[PDB]
Amino acid sequence: LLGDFFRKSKEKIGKEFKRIVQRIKDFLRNLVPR
């Protein structure tokens, strides 16, 4: 986002967000399986 500034912070944030999205995906796959 902010150009090439805050590489480290932006990568940590992206990490956690991907973790969250993955767990929400797992949950929805258990809610409506297939």
**Could you say which of ligand LDA, a copy of itself, none residue 7 binds, taking C-beta under 5 to 8 angstroms by partner kind?**
ligand LDA
From the number of C-beta atoms within 10 Å of its C-beta (0-12, 13-18, 19+), residue 27 rates as exposed
Residue closer to ligand LDA by CB (options 10, 29) is 10
Whole-angstrom distance, CA of residue 13 vs CA of residue 25? 18
> What minimum distance in Å lies between the beta carbon of 34 and ligand LDA?
17
Is the CB of residue 10 less than 8 Å from the CB of residue 2? yes
Contacting residues toward ligand LDA, per CB under 6 A: 1, 5-7, 10-11, 13-14, 17, 20, 23-24, 27
